[PDB]
């Protein structure tokens, strides 16, 4: 509580006052794209970091269900850079609906860029990014139904996630963080999912040359022990079974509902340990979470495959997807729910993406 609980700033670190400003409501700056965006009201909690109702330069003024929303933070700032570089690299208007095209899709989850402005003042200089609208957290939802989620549902992620997934890992850009914290749905469209705020998108690709399974725990360290892969764990460089693994072990948690190593994450080596254990006796961990008059064969294949999986070994999403469909005709079901998760629930938002904090050069 604030007269309870103190909240610390900090001790020894910044100095000064920095105080920070705004923009007056009903101004339309123009972004590097040579594009119109009107800015309203302000909207969310935070400080230094809020968001700012953003539309089309269109007309009157702005309500309270603008179409785009604008986010502010420092320039200096790492992580920010990428989430916004990614976004006009990665989230471009023609590499979004290319996809769809030579996919024979209908429409993409991939968050759509709109622009961005930076402005310099005795010194400081900021910058901030023209992102879309959403609905709701799906990580919000879960907390909201006491963490339980249904087999429809989870299953129903699994899909959409893997299109998504080959999306960037054809482009040389490992996922990273493929949590729920990261996920969104259309407030027009409730069962369309969204994963926005990457903070873990990066490559190990560059010049065609793939990260061989190498000591580097520099890079690729950023991440919390609730599902930080086990390159990082070890110490090892960025390989393809980390994304696996960081789907994989949500995809338990939303299942069964907690982790075996949910009541010991203070304790860094027993999650390690764990896991290892568990790697090679993985019909040991569906026995213990599910019983025995239970045992949900597209969990035991599904890491069957991550176990089994080799470093020059390729992604088998193909198998996998037969798992899938599998497990719902094994179980006299089929896809009934889609994703159930339209309730709405926003105040604020995140821009990251990069993966490497810790001291920070």
């Given at each position: 509580?604030?007269?309870?609980?103190?909240?610390?700033?900090?001790?020894?670190?910044?100095?000064?006052?920095?105080?920070?400003?705004?923009?007056?409501?009903?101004?339309?700056?123009?972004?590097?794209?040579?594009?119109?965006?009107?800015?309203?009201?302000?909207?969310?909690?935070?400080?230094?970091?809020?968001?700012?109702?953003?539309?089309?330069?269109?007309?009157?003024?702005?309500?309270?269900?603008?179409?785009?929303?604008?986010?502010?933070?420092?320039?200096?700032?790492?992580?920010?850079?990428?989430?916004?570089?990614?976004?006009?690299?990665?989230?471009?208007?023609?590499?979004?609906?290319?996809?769809?095209?030579?996919?024979?899709?209908?429409?993409?989850?991939?968050?759509?860029?709109?622009?961005?402005?930076?402005?310099?003042?005795?010194?400081?200089?900021?910058?901030?990014?023209?992102?879309?609208?959403?609905?709701?957290?799906?990580?919000?939802?879960?907390?909201?139904?006491?963490?339980?989620?249904?087999?429809?549902?989870?299953?129903?992620?699994?899909?959409?996630?893997?299109?998504?997934?080959?999306?960037?890992?054809?482009?040389?850009?490992?996922?990273?963080?493929?949590?729920?914290?990261?996920?969104?749905?259309?407030?027009?469209?409730?069962?369309?999912?969204?994963?926005?705020?990457?903070?873990?998108?990066?490559?190990?690709?560059?010049?065609?040359?793939?990260?061989?399974?190498?000591?580097?725990?520099?890079?690729?360290?950023?991440?919390?022990?609730?599902?930080?892969?086990?390159?990082?764990?070890?110490?090892?460089?960025?390989?393809?079974?980390?994304?696996?693994?960081?789907?994989?072990?949500?995809?338990?948690?939303?299942?069964?509902?907690?982790?075996?190593?949910?009541?010991?994450?203070?304790?860094?080596?027993?999650?390690?340990?764990?896991?290892?254990?568990?790697?090679?006796?993985?019909?040991?961990?569906?026995?213990?979470?599910?019983?025995?008059?239970?045992?949900?064969?597209?969990?035991?294949?599904?890491?069957?495959?991550?176990?089994?999986?080799?470093?020059?070994?390729?992604?088998?999403?193909?198998?996998?997807?037969?798992?899938?469909?599998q497990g719902l005709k094994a179980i006299g079901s089929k896809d009934d729910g889609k994703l159930d998760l339209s309730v709405v629930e926003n105040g604020g938002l995140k821009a990251k993406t990069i993966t490497k904090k810790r001291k920070k050069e």
């Amino acid at each position: 509580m604030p007269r309870v609980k103190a909240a610390q700033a900090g001790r020894q670190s910044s100095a000064k006052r920095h105080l920070a400003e705004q923009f007056a409501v009903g101004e339309i700056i123009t972004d590097m794209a040579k594009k119109e965006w009107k800015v309203g009201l302000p909207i969310g909690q935070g400080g230094f970091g809020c968001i700012y109702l953003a539309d089309m330069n269109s007309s009157e003024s702005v309500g309270s269900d603008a179409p785009c929303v604008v986010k502010v933070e420092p320039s200096d700032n790492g992580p920010l850079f990428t989430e916004l570089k990614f976004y006009q690299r990665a989230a471009k208007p023609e590499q979004i609906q290319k996809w769809i095209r030579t996919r024979k899709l209908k429409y993409l989850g991939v968050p759509k860029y709109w622009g961005s402005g930076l402005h310099d003042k005795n010194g400081k200089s900021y910058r901030f990014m023209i992102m879309d609208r959403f609905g709701s957290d799906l990580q919000k939802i879960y907390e909201a139904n006491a963490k339980r989620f249904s087999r429809k549902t989870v299953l129903q992620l699994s899909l959409r996630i893997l299109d998504i997934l080959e999306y960037i890992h054809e482009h040389e850009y490992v996922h990273g963080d493929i949590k729920a914290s990261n996920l969104l749905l259309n407030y027009k469209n409730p069962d369309q999912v969204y994963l926005v705020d990457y903070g873990l998108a990066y490559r190990y690709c560059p010049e065609g040359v793939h990260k061989e399974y190498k000591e580097d725990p520099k890079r690729c360290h950023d991440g919390t022990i609730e599902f930080t892969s086990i390159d990082a764990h070890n110490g090892v460089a960025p390989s393809r079974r980390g994304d696996l693994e960081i789907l994989g072990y949500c995809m338990i948690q939303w299942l069964t509902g907690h982790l075996p190593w949910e009541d010991n994450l203070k304790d860094p080596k027993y999650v390690r340990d764990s896991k290892i254990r568990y790697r090679e006796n993985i019909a040991s961990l569906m026995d213990k979470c599910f019983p025995e008059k239970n045992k949900p064969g597209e969990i035991a294949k599904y890491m069957e495959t991550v176990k089994l999986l080799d470093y020059t070994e390729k992604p088998l999403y193909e198998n996998l997807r037969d798992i899938l469909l599998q497990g719902l005709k094994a179980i006299g079901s089929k896809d009934d729910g889609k994703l159930d998760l339209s309730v709405v629930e926003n105040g604020g938002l995140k821009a990251k993406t990069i993966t490497k904090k810790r001291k920070k050069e």
